[PDB]
RNA sequence: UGAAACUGUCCUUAGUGCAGAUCUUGGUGGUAGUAGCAAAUACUAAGAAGAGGAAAAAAACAUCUUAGAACUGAAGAGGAGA
């Protein structure tokens, strides 16, 4: 579970969803040690659902 | 170094000697990798093409298709004329 509210607290509004993608990519790099991260189509759509 | 013309003495002649004219024309510096590249709400994921996202996050990646999210808001960022 990624507590996304921690990362996006008091963030610029027009850069909230794009930064949600960047943070997740960073968490995959620091965990799986791979620099090639591919987002599922469903994950991207959910982030932008709001 | 350069590869085809030139020099010394005597007279004669003159478009004859430059550091300045905010001189004329051409070239080049320090400033300086500095000031900037900030109006028009906004981009994201997958794939294709390409030399052109690599990587100890080098955090950003132009074009096209699909999906999401959006703006002009019909006296329009639409469709047409002088």
From TrEMBL:
<comment type="similarity">
    <text>Belongs to the eukaryotic ribosomal protein eL31 family.</text>
</comment>
<protein>
    <submittedName>
        <fullName>60S ribosomal protein L31, putative</fullName>
    </submittedName>
</protein>
């Amino acid at each position: 579970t990624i507590h996304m509210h921690a990362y996006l607290h008091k963030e610029s509004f027009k850069k909230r969803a794009p930064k949600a993608i960047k943070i997740i990519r960073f968490l995959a790099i620091k965990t799986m040690k791979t620099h090639v991260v591919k987002f599922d189509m469903g994950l991207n759509q959910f982030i932008w659902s709001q």
